[PDB]
């Protein structure tokens, strides 16, 4: 649009002692006058301006970059054999990297931190573009890192909110894809053991799944529907696995510290995703491909190791907030996964919860919370 | 005493012999009981029971007197007054001020009163039988408590079906035991042990009676319920006897001491295994109470079995959607007792 032009006017005006910057800006403004151009000619002064680390070069640049990514201006590398050379230089991973690189720890200016959270949000969660792979997971991790590392309470909060919206969206998109999948299956029919053992029980191989490039979808053949479904589901699995892993750290006797805040946001996000999208987890149509043999595997069976690991490490915590969030996760597992998790449920009941009830010096509130979970299970299915 | 004998040939022969030797008095009394009428049988039983309450019949002579008493019961067609008198005379025989009978003699009396309770048609008779039965077994265990009390002073993978084949203590051909009477460590050991074999035999008998596989007022269910009730009463009222590490019973094979709890383990677990998951709420609730006692006092000794019961019976129940809500809530209440203990 023209926000591109206002951005370049501000950048060229505020360039100051940086001649190269002014020159790239003006070169871009000139190139626009033929009404747009080569993505790189517009992207060069934006990128450079983000590297000054001052206001308003950096904030204006970040704003422009996020909006340009959301308008599908930038694209990802392709492996189509029908490309003729005329295609633009793919720049989306680089645009997202440029945004992410502006956060360099707690000394980064608070206005810039905020602008980074908003630009990643605009890049990742918009109405025209779906980003998959490394770019998405980088945006998500960067918003988390700002939540964890900023010394601004305000920024910690907007980051928490934005992170929640992002992980929520990744799973909502998967839920939509499964809904479509089941509609297609229906249409198709119409026409006619200890606690210590659980840390070493990983049936699903997920080596190098975090790897792989950024892809982009805009908003016909079953092979293609299956591959898209795989993209969506893989985003989901990587997000979920990430939070289980963050939840598994062991702490000694802390609530405003980074370790405890990390454990809490991880457990909270795991619980929220389970509660709001339990059908994504339990559907026998939800399938992700193993890395070793490329054989399709049930989603629940694939995340099982990480879920049980999160509970193994955090159940029986002496911190009541952590104990409570595990109780709720365990409730979901007890209610919607009795069959798939039968043995694990048995271990958690014997070695963590009943063990706690039998313990004489154990906090009474915790005991009552657990027993309350049992009563809730009696009065539901 | 003489009045009883005054109230055909043997009778007067006894009176003549008084001018006394036990057999001459025991002969007409025994014969009189076989009449099956009032007031012959009632008076004879009355007298025999009183004599056993005394030490006239003694340390086998007590067993024959008790046999004669027990033989007066031939089922529900037996006259009600005779039933009641039998219950009272057996009470007087087991619970008196001077004499404690051990072994078969004890075990014969207790089984008989139980049977009267099971077979009588008199609500009154079955109830008084129940009360006396409870008092008998309670008294046996109380006696053991006293003996242990003296003794410390003087000293100073695994499943529900495997539990049916896990018997570490062998009591094959342990038998009822010989009849003995109570009013130098070896004599003391013989005595402490005397009490302990009595207790073990009672408890085993009741677990066994509880072990049958199957309305609510019929004989099988009333048998099951009274066995479970008594088992629970013994655990609840005399737990220290079960938990005491000095309370020891000698194996039948090699006479090597074994802890009492470890000895009754098989039978207690069998009782829970067979009755734990019953669809009938009374049985379910009583088993729950027993399981509670096992949970509170035998966590160390019974860890694996408790784990088996939790996984295969109670949690299983909690997981079933079509399961009765009342049972689930009874179990969860047990767990909550575990919270606020």
Numbering used by the authors:
A (entry chain A): 4 to 38, 42 to 198, 245 to 271, 293 to 326, 331 to 458
B (entry chain D): 7 to 13, 25 to 36, 43 to 82, 96 to 192, 244 to 270, 294 to 324, 331 to 457
Paper text:
Here, we present the crystal structure of the regulatory DCB and HUS domains from Thielavia terrestris Sec7 and demonstrate that they form a single continuous structural domain. Following correction of the annotated intron, a construct comprising residues 1–458 of T. terrestris produced crystals diffracting to 2.6 Å. Using experimental phase determination by single-wavelength anomalous diffraction of selenomethionine-substituted protein, the structure of the DCB and HUS domains was determined with four copies in the asymmetric unit. The best resolved chains in the model lack only unresolved loops and the final ~35 conserved residues of the HUS domain absent from the crystallized construct. In the T. terrestris DCB/HUS domain structure, residues 245–271 of this interdomain region (between helices 8 and 10, including helix 9) are resolved in their packing against the armadillo repeat, and the remaining 46 and 21 residue stretches are unresolved in the structure. Dimerization is known to occur in N-terminal constructs of Sec7 and its homologs, and small-angle X-ray scattering (SAXS) analysis confirmed that the observed dimerization mode occurred in solution as well as in the crystal. As such, it appears unlikely that the intact DCB/HUS construct (1–492) is prone to the same artifactual dimerization issues at its C-terminus as is the truncated Sec7(1–458) construct.
At the TGN, the Arf1-5 GTPases are activated by the BIG1/2 proteins in humans and the Arf1/2 GTPases are activated by Sec7 in the model organism Saccharomyces cerevisiae. Conserved domains C-terminal to the GEF domain, termed HDS1-4 (homology downstream of Sec7), act to integrate the signals from several small GTPases, including Arf1 itself, to switch Sec7 from a strongly autoinhibited to a strongly autoactivated form. The N-terminal DCB (dimerization and cyclophilin binding) and HUS (homology upstream of Sec7) domains, though conserved in all Golgi Arf-GEFs and essential for Golgi function, remain more of an enigma.
